[PDB]
């Protein structure tokens with residue numbers, strides 16, 4: 001589809017068997033999801049921006065379904081104010097910016 | 100143009116007569132530029148980032164070029180990790196997400 005930016009570009013995603021609302025975020029290098037269980041090993045990481053930094057757990061090789069498009073990649077889990085789909089997964093579904 | 104997301108969508112902007120690098124950030128509601136001199140009065144604005152909320156300065160009706168596309172609108176000034184072109188101006192220049 002084509003998504004305009006009058007409002008936040010929120011979509012429904014499926015991750016770890018849960019449905020969640022997430023923001024298509026071209027400014028995010030990686031995907032960041034609110035606290036949840038994910039299977040596998042993880043390593044701690046810090047990410048930040050305006051307001052400072054948060055600590056997240058980095059899980060690799062996680063499958064997420066985004067608007068019917070399956071993509072696999074790294075997911076950071078931690079206290080993000082909003083669920084974020086970052087570039088690492090946006091590329092996999094063929095998402096571009098156009099103007 | 101059509102911009103893919105394998106790398107950060109960094110573009111050249113022109114503001115206050117000077118060229119700067121900025122990030123096309125669909126996850127940002129607003130446009131936030133690093134400390135510089137802008138004309139006119141400013142108003143207070145609280146924005147929520149990944150790490151918390153902070154106060155920045157809001158200037159309205161500011162002339163700005165983004166990837167050569169002329170725009171006029173609201174620009175916030177504050178301690179941002181990189182210059183950010185957010186949804187307010189992305190919308191104005193006709194930028195959509197597509198997949």
Ligand SMILES: NC(=O)c1ccc(CN[C@H]2CNC[C@@H]2N(Cc2ccc(C(F)(F)F)cc2)S(=O)(=O)c2ccc(C(N)=O)cc2)cc1
Nearest residue numbers: 027028029030047048049050126127128129146148149180
């Ligand atoms: N390192 C990572 O992978 C990472 C880092 C941060 C995030 C959170 N998402 C980013 C992108 N959109 C806004 C958000 N932020 C932009 C941003 C942009 C770039 C970077 C950096 F280059 F450092 F990696 C960090 C943060 S933000 O928090 O500074 C922000 C929030 C709101 C607004 C606004 N209202 O205009 C402006 C800026 C997600 C992932």
Ligand SMILES: [Cl-]
Nearest residue numbers: 072073074088
């Ligand atoms: Cl990845």
Ligand SMILES: [Cl-]
Nearest residue numbers: 091094103104
């Ligand atoms: Cl591609």
Ligand SMILES: [Cl-]
Nearest residue numbers: 172173187188
């Ligand atoms: Cl505006």
